[PDB]
Structures are given as structure tokens and as C-alpha cells.
Symmetry: D2
Subunit: 393 residues, 4 copies
Amino acid sequence: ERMTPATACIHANPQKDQFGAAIPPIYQTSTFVFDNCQQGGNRFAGQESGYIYTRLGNPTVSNLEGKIAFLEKTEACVATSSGMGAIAATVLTILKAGDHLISDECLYGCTHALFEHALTKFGIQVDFINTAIPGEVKKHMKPNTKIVYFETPANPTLKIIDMERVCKDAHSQEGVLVIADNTFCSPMITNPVDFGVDVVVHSATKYINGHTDVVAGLICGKADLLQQIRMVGIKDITGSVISPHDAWLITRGLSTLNIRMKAESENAMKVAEYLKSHPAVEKVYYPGFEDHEGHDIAKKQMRMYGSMITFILKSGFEGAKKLLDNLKLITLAVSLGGCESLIQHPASMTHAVVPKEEREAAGITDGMIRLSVGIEDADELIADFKQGLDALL
Amino acid sequence: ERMTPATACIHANPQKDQFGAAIPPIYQTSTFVFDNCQQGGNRFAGQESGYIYTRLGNPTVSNLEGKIAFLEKTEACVATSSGMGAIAATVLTILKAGDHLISDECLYGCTHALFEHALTKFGIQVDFINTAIPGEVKKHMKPNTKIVYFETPANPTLKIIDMERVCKDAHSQEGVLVIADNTFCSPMITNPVDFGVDVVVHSATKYINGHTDVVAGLICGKADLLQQIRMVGIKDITGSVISPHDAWLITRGLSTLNIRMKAESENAMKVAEYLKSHPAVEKVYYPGFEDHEGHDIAKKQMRMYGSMITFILKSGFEGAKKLLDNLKLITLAVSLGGCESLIQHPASMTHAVVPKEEREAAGITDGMIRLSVGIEDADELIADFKQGLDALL
Amino acid sequence: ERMTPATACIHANPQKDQFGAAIPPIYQTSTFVFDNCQQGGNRFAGQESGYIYTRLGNPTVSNLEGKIAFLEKTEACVATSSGMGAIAATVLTILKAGDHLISDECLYGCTHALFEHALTKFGIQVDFINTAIPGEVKKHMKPNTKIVYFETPANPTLKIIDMERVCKDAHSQEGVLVIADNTFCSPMITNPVDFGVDVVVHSATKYINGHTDVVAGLICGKADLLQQIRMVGIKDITGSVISPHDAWLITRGLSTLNIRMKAESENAMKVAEYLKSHPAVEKVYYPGFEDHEGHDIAKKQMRMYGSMITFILKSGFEGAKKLLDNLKLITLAVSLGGCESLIQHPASMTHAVVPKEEREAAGITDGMIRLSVGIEDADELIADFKQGLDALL
Amino acid sequence: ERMTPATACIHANPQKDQFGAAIPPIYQTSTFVFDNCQQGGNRFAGQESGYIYTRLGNPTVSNLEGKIAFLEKTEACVATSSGMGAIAATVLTILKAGDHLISDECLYGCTHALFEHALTKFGIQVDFINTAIPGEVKKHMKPNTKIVYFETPANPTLKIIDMERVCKDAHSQEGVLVIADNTFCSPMITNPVDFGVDVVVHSATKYINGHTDVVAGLICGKADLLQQIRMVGIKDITGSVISPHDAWLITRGLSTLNIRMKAESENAMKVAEYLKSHPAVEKVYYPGFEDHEGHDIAKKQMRMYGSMITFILKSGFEGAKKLLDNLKLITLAVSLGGCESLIQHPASMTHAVVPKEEREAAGITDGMIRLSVGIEDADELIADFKQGLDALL
């Protein structure tokens, strides 16, 4: 049997340091010395291994990358200095003016604007559609279609998308790449390549680093395509070069990934169920609910049902502000996936950049509240919510 | 009188830390806690100051930014996670399919690829010209021209370009931006806005950090434009987000920037003079030489002549490899601007990515060597060249 | 009710950062600016709060300190740059030539040397006894006795020591301090002040940081005593000043301390049971065994039974080397308490500094192996032991 | 010729990393993996090279150490987590109850209390005398004398001590070790072993790191004595283990040591001379003054006259507070040796811990002001002083 995920977030891609450091050292160096001119020109030509310069590759960054590639069961991984840089380095390597991209319409807010406003201006065409309806991706393909893109569960309604059926329709013509943002599951919950996906991206900012102190992105997929994302999309187009220091912080955060993912998913099931029972609460979205739309597809794709919860209060937006301003243990902030529980209001904060219409066409409402459950004691978490929620009743 | 450069690289844009920390702390945090929901919505809407999320701004990175904006005399500065990222976020926010771009043909290798290959698949038109020749700029101006771009001295030949002349030609038409990559000078030798330039970019991986351990970029210019570059170039298109830990290190490196540039320049003039006298060397390009073409222009534009030297051996390619393989003190690696002296072979190494005819048209021959002098003892530096060179003869 | 341990390792001693940073910043500053001379003189005289100089206190190190003091229920905590430094600063502030010290003979190797060799050249008297035997403490008490010291479970045999009994004997005379090294439990399994202990020390290089990349110590106890240890032990005698960067990393590591200790313990009980059943093993010392001597005491004193296991092979010294040289998943190195499982041979490695008769009197034989279980998959851990062990037979 | 100091703060003790990192990586690891049991027991026995555990030694820390050892022309160097830890690890390895220590009476304030109050309590005898008078060390020796200790120039009056004459008297009986704290000169200004000293210590906090963000100490001297300071004074007594991260910050700061020392010494000569001419100023102490006491000995021992200045205003202590509170570029804080200029009042701040009598017996007055000149533009520095000083007249 393959190393388990639990063992592998600590031991996959073992490094060999010359002094036998238990924890591989930090390669904070912009540049690497050649033994001679012929070796440097050989590396430059892609004909000899070894390092050259940190925008092109770095040993600490490669350690993280081979550990992520193993956990995602992909041939290679390229690390970048933010989830947006991973998204952008991948699609601006693959696309040129005249190509076509299809995307799910419920996306993180900044992915939506990269697709809607920048790819648009570089002559690329995009469709935003609900990729969860059976058949919509095939109805929107054209000869020139190159990428189909989605996030599941989606940020932030937690909509579920049947990846395998999206793939089957996208690969029904040649030359189409399916890209899935797996930030909200992490590689402990889902491996998108299992279902036909070609490329898997992450905001490592969230669960993978898990400690709210690093911004970073990851690209996982085949070696030859990622070699072109490295030499074109990283080298030249985005310049999104992860600091070797932050890469070594994310390997450190990775090694408790499996224990954090289980504990956050167990705490989140308790909290979502508590919330769903409270009288001030109207509606709770959580992929583990049997009444969730796409539950059954979520169960086939997800090993655990995650730590994201989204819910709506019967007091709407003003109720939301009150709950939120009065919480004491839960933290008001954007981002998600850390050890501590965070909460925010997506229409005034993360999805504010997307025009209301476009929000609501996707299902983003003005009363939604988005919660990312940490590893605090579940009863204290429920109790912070009880006190905030009782105050609205 | 303005705070001098030598004081300002330590004291411009002073911080106010609540504990009075002498060295402002490292914000190695991905996100920021709102006091209440309103403040959150306000910050997102640009109505209230404060921090939100490290892809969008962070106090350690603002400190470095305001210190560089002061030193380049610009209203603002945006820091990035590589010099390519500063260039790309800059030109990808400005241009859109259909615009036109004029650049100096002699550029860093990687920028030339971005501009020849990337830009052009995005529907941008590009021409590479000699902006150092009177009239070439105005003759290539087109109605859709948006950027005129160049480096002086140029990488790797050290060509001098008359900034003031290029700017008056580019700005003879409305709506053009002149962008100068000021890496090789640093804000201590040149402030390109003094000459009419509108946007100044840097690879802060070179002299500004000065310690060869950080890869980062900087963008300097008007608040208006740089707010657009921060919300579009950085936030969505490149995702080139600097690590706060690396920003702090650059800030640190920045504080010796004045004494390192003077000491590097002093050393360089001695080493350049020594190379010039040596019978194995055909040519030495240095901006301080009296005969260096554009020496009066170099003199009006540079407070110091820099630590870059480029030279060509009479034995060409095979003599350059021999000399670079027997150097014992000067270090063989790409990059430049560190405390230690570095050297490389442009044609096979930093510019091997440029089709040979383009290198040749810009004067990059295969007998050419590029040297960045650091702060070792100038007599030990000359002695390394003496033994290596005498072994050639 | 008190904030639970599981919440408090993330939220006790909350910080107030001026920008609302989610993760309080790294004060990597040696010194602090006074607003005026008076405030400077006031701070130095203890009349005004604030910071002066990182040998004397730093906000990142106070944050870690107050979080540990909360978790051990002590009024204060002083962090140091190694577990030895916490022990030394502690006992060197208390004692003076002429005092007497009583310690458990089974100690970490290095503490035993400090106490047998260092203390005694300084004119301190020391006796090493079995504090686990009823009456030994009171029988060695002397009028000049100042400290009674011990570790439970002990390093490396896992002897349990009845804290409550040792404290009532030591405190039957006035003026004695009981000091417990709580490293092997961590504040999540045991709070030794609950039992009458007066001073709790840790090697935070072990479970509290939990990631094997930091060497640091902690001292926990009354404000009075620890103010003396900070101004004398730390400031003048040891100079064991923690790096703010390493403090911040420990804080970071601390936030998973609860889920790592539970997961380590769960794993350990399975691995200990497996070793116990194996025909090549003569004996397994684990605190959770029903037959483990002092299992009722271990049970009153520990919330979990820990991840330390010590075992003796029926083949002695030569069988221990063979097994430790063919282990593929468990890592051979000294130290313990990390996410990865570590193992070593006490007699030739952590305790080889102890004259052999003293090791032997404390039960350290040469067939003994010490194991610290981490958070890998328990079935892969047992399978490594199975192949290594079966190769012995 | 030996590598010059200028070249050697960058290139002495060159490291060989397996990937040819231009800047050796950071070994942030508590622990090192053995290839087998026999290798670990061999290292533990001092019979085989390689690493074991970071309290005992670490490759990044060793890089700094060999670079300091080369610049101080000593066989070895041991790095510690504060200057006090270096002082204390050296003298608590060498001394035992019954020994005798002679020290100069003008010392940093915390060295004075370690000698006066802690060594005293561990049965060691100490004499505080003025070691600058010809003959005083010999008059105070006894059979049991083991160490003679001093700082020159002294902190903070800048008193000069003729090291060679102190050595000649201390080595006039066998078994005596001369220890000189060379913090205020740095190895660019003085090598104390030139004059007969056996052991040289530093607060690396000051000039050597040079960037006010690291607390650390260094011990330089023979290999066999430093091997005992490592295995006893570091391992066991002080536990003063430098973080490998801060050691790599101090190597980074080291590489501009020679350019910073020259620039701070040139700026300090200008500033001291300016101060000496101002009408509100009464007395200025600067080793470069020809009327300094011990000038001629300072000239033989010091290559440059340093950046420390101490001066007294005719308005005494209240004048001091006013000047200081009104300075704008100079920073009010303790510590010294950074890139930025710092200033403080030694009797209410650094030497307040020493009883007035003892201060003044040494020459510390209540009007002294102690300044450590950075690398700002000298005219702006003089101008900040002019504006503060004119306000007193």
C-alpha cells in the first residue's frame, strides 16, 4: 500500500541533507553557484539538473512541492506566492487571445474578477455557468474551448459539483484541460485527479499551511504542463515566486494537516448541527447535511465533510452584523482554514468585488455568514454562538 | 532641505510601533481582525484605512514601500515577490489587447521574453528598438502606443539611454507612459522621475536587498496608477505577493544601501580600470569611463557609476569559460548586486533565452562577460582577475 | 468555568496589535525606543511598564509566556533559549554555596551532570535519591535543604513519582521548593502545581513546540520567584535569552499542542500494546499499562498517558542496535515530542554522559530503548516495528 | 597574505552546500538523524564528527563561529544567545568555589552584577580594580587567581586599558586566563590576542550583527578551552543556545561589518569634534582625541577609533534630559552598534543597576551621555545635535 496521507504529510518526499538535519534547512538564497561555466549553461538549457536561481526553483520549495504532489497523487507541483498567482500562472500559461474558458459561476471573488475582467482584456473569452447542472459544460463548448474551471465545494455557498461528469463533458473534445480549485477540501479530503481533473490548484494560505501566517498557492498536475507553467507563467508572466522561508513554514504546517483536517471537520459537524437547531437561525449549508444539494456527490468526492459552514439568520443582514460583532471566541476576519475559527459576511467582505447581481445569480445572499471552524473545544464554540444568537431572540 | 539618501535609507517613512520597537516587527500574518462588521465593509469599500488581507497590503510591506517611494521621489510604491512580478503587474495592468508597446531591445533576458512572447499572445503589439538613437522612439510611435520601456544602463551591455530625450519623444503624443527599470542603479545613483519617467521598476533581489537571499520586486510611481496595479496587477493578475518576512529582510538590507553602493562603485572603478589595461581583454564597458559612449549622459543621470562592469575577452567564448572557471574569489552564478562579487556569461546564461540574432543585434556577443562588483578588498579582487587572466595568456 | 486547554493553547493571553493582525507580529528587535528619558529611568526602576531590551523582556516572548503560564495555572512564566537554561536559571537563582539540593536520581542526562558536577563545584550539596520511595525525601532533608527536584514520568525509564507525597514531605520543613520537570507530559496532560509543586520547568524544544525545529525552555511558577529568575538567572547568570523568532514559532507550534498530544497518546497506547505482545521484547514501560507500577498515581496525575514508551529487548545491547538500524519509518536521533516518531539508545546516547553505575542504579540498562511516538498512521508505525523486530528473530 | 578583514567578513570559512546555495541555508532543526547507532554513540563520545543536537552544535551556527574565529585570529569560537551568556559560559566553566577573579571596575552594568553578586554566591572571590594603572593587576594576584577580565574601551566612559601590560602581569604566575570583552571595537578594530589575551568575548548584539534585531554573544579562543566551554558552560550551566535563525541573521549582518565600522568611525570623529566645540557641551570623551587618557595605547590597539562617544553637558542631568528628549534623528534607546545612531543616559538606564558609589568610583557620572554613531549623513547628525544643543543655550 501507498504511504497513508497521515504518514505522508510528515514523511512523503524525504530530503537528504548532508548533515542529516531532522528538518531540512531553509534555502533563503536568491542564487546558486555553478561549479563551472558548462554546468550553468547546461542547466539553463534544461539539459542538466541542479538549481540556478530562486524565481526558477529552490530546494526548500521543491521539498514542499514533492510532498503536495504526492498527497494529490499528481506527477508534479509548482508553488507560488499566492493562491491567485497559482490560478493566474496556470491559465495565462495555457491561454492566448482567441481561446475560450468555461468556469463555474460561483467562485471566490478575486478568481471571478481575474476571469471576468483581465482574461477578457487579453482577448480570451469566458463563460460563467452553473457547472453543477448535468450537461451545461457541453452546451457551452466551442472548437476553441481550452479550459473548464470550478471549485467544489464553492466559495462561499458550498455548492457541490460533480467533477467526473464535468470532466466527461470537457474531455468530449480534444485538447481541453479541467482545472479544479481544491482549496476548501485540501488533499486530505479529496483528490480531484481521481475524477478526471487534469490540474488541481490551491490557496495554500488556507488549510495546507493551516496557521494564518503565510500567503501562498500551489499547482498540481502533470510534469510537462507544470514545466511550462514554471518557465512561462511563473518565470515571465506572474513573477509569483514563493519565499523559501514561507515554503518551509507551509511544510511545517503541513505536518499537522491530517490531524487538523479531522479535528476541524469533527468540530464543524457539531457546530453546524447546533446552528441548524437555533431559533434565530434560518438556513444552514454544510455538505454533510443529508438535505444538502449534491450531498450524495459530496459523499463520493469528500472523505470528510470539511470545516466550512455557511448560514443565514432570520434577521438578515442586520442580524448578521450583530451576531458577528458580539462573538467572543470566533474571530472576525477574512480567510479561513486556520487553527482558530474565523467568520465573515461575504457580500460586504470577500465577494463585495463581485457585482450584487452576479453574486445573487450565483446564490450569494446579503444575509449569508461564512464560518471556517478551527480546533477549539466544540462546546466553547457552541457557547460563543449561543450567547450571540440568544441576543437576537 | 530633503532628508538625504544616506539618512533616509534608514529613517524615511518611520513607523509607530505600540511598544516602541526599534526595528518594526514582522507582520507574518495572512489576515487582520476587524473590530466590527462595519469597519470590515468600510475597509473593503476604500472608505476606511487599515488592513485586511496580506495579498492586499500588510504593515511590514507598507513600511518597505514608503521607504522606497521616498528614495525614488515617487508618490507610492508597490512591492512584489520578484522583479518579473513588478514588471508584469505593471505592464499587465496598463495594457489590453490592441495596445502597442515600445521597448529597448537590450533588456534583461526574461523581460524580453515576457514582452516578445507573452504580451504578443495577448494581442498586444510590441517593437524592440534602440531607444538610445535619436528619433527611433518618435518614429515608432503609433496611435495605440501606451508604454515606452527601457533599462539604463542596459542588462547586460551597460548601454546608456538618454532618459530625458526618450521621455520628451514618448510624451510628444498624449497618453504614453515611460517605464524605466532602475535596478542597476538603485535609487541611490538615479531617480528616473527626475527625467520625466512615469513608472520606475526594480528587481529588489539585486542591490536594494543587497544580500542575495531574497527575490522581490518594486514598483514606484503615482498613487493613481499604483492603486490600479495593486488592485488589478497584484490582486488578480499576477498574485505576486511579497512575504512580509522577505519585505522585512529587504528593509534591513536597505539600511546599508548607501554605504554598499558607494563601496561597490569605488571598487568597480578600480576593477574596471584594471580590466581595461589588460592585454587579454578587448573591450570594457563601464559608465565611469571618459570614452564610454554616453558618459556625459551617464554623468548627468547617475550620482555614482555603479558596480556593474561588462567586458569582452580577445579569445571569445572559449577564453571566457576558462577565465570564469579559474576565478577563486569572484563567484560564478547569475544575479548581481550582492555584497559578494558575482560574474556570469550572458549569452549562455541570463540571455540564452533570447534568440541569438536578437542578442547579437543588441551587442550581446559570446565573448562578453558581466560582473557585479561587491565589497571585498579591491586589490584581492584585481588579484583574482590577474591570476585568472594571466593563465589565459 | 476556566477556558479549556484545547481552546487556550490557541486563545489564552490574547494580544492587542495596533493593526489587528490575526497572528501577532515577530518583535525581532534587540531594543526599544523610549518616548522620553523619564520613561526610560522609570522602566529601568520597575515603576513603569513597557519594554527596554530583549535580554530583559520582549512582547513576542511575553505572549508565549502568558499562554504557558495560563496552561500550567501558574502566575508567571519565563521563557529561555533551552530546557537546560530554564533549569539552570532556576536553580542558579535559588541556590548559593552552602545550600542543599535533593533530586531524583533518574533525570535527563544533562540535568544530572549539571547537578552532580556544576552545582557541586559551586559549593552546593546535592544527593540523588529515589523520590518514588516513601520516606526517602524526608530522610534526606537537611536544615539547609532548598530544592527538591524530579521528573515524572522520568527520562528515560518512565518511573512515576507521587507528586503529592513528595511535596508534603519536602514542605514538612519550611523554605523548601519542589521543582518538577513537566516536559514529558506538557501542560496538556499534567499541571504539577495541582499537587503542591512550586516551580514547573520544560524543555519546550520537545512537545510544546512539537516540530523539532526549536530549542527553548520554560519556567512556570509565582510572580515573585520568577521575577528574581528573570533579573538574576536570565539577565546575569545564564544569558539564556530566547530569540523572538523562535518564541513566535513555539507559539505557533503550541496552537496544535492539544490535538498533537491526544493523537500522540492514542498512537502510543497502540504501539506500546504491540511491543508488549512481541516475543523479542522483555519489558515495556508505558504509563497507561494496568500493571505499570504507579499506574494509579499516573492515572491521578495525567489526563493522557503520553507518547513516550521505553522498552528492553531480550537480546540486550546488540539486539537494540540491530532493531534501531533497520527501522524505516521511525527516526533515529535524540530529542522527542515532535510530529515525527523518534527513537534512541539512552545508555549510549542521551545518558552516556552519566557514569554507568548511576545509570544502572536508576534502571537505565543497555538493552533499553526510548521511543517518542508522533502522529503517523499507528498501523504503519507498528508495521515498522514488526519488520525490524521479526528480523531480530 | 591572509585574506583581508574586508574580504573575510563575506568569504572566510566558506561553506559547501550540496546544491551550491550562494548563501548557506538555515538549519532551524533541534535535532540530527544518525545513519546508525554506532555513529550516534561515536559522536556522543567525541570520537566522530557530525551533528547531534542544536544545544551541542549546529551547522549554521558553526558557519558564523568559523567566520568570527578567523576575524579574531583565534582557533575557535562558540556562539551563545546573548553577550551575558558568553561571559557567563566562559567564567562558570573556568571557575569553581575557592577561585579568584580580577576585573577592571568599569564594566557594562550587567557584567558587574554577575561578577559582584552571582560569582560571589558560588564561593568565588572577585576584586574590582582599575586595571589601567600600571602594576594594579599584579598587586592583587593570589595563588588562587584564575582570570583577569576587562573591557577596552570601557562601557561607558571609554577608558583605555593597555592590554599587553595587563597580560604580562597576569601571566607572571601560571594558570591565569586573560579575558577581554571586545564588543566596543569589534574584530575590525582590534584583535585582543595580538596583545597576549587568551579569550575574547563579544555581545554580538552590537556591531557584529549591526542591525539591532538580534541578541547574541560570542566566545573566541583556543579549541580545547572552548570545547570545555561548549560541553560544560553551554550544555549544562547556562543553556545559552543561539537560535540558528539568529546566527544566520548575524552572518548576514557580518558581511557589511567592515564598511559599517569604517563609516561609523568616520561619522563619529566628525560628530565628536562638533560636540566638543559646542558651548553647551562641557566635556567629550572619544579615544581618537589626542587629549584622551590612554590615547597612545588606544592608537596602538585600535585600527579605527570606534563609534562610541560619551559627553557631559554643562547643564548636567537636567540638561541631558532635555537634549535627549528633543533629538529628532538620533534614537533614544539602550544598546549600541547599529546602523542607526542611538543615545542614552547611563546612570538611569544601562548602569542604574550598579550602585551610585560604585559608578562614580569608576568614573560614571550623572551627567554622562552615551552616543553610538550610525551611518546616517554626518551633517544631518550634527544638525540634529545643533538644534537640541542650541535650545539649552
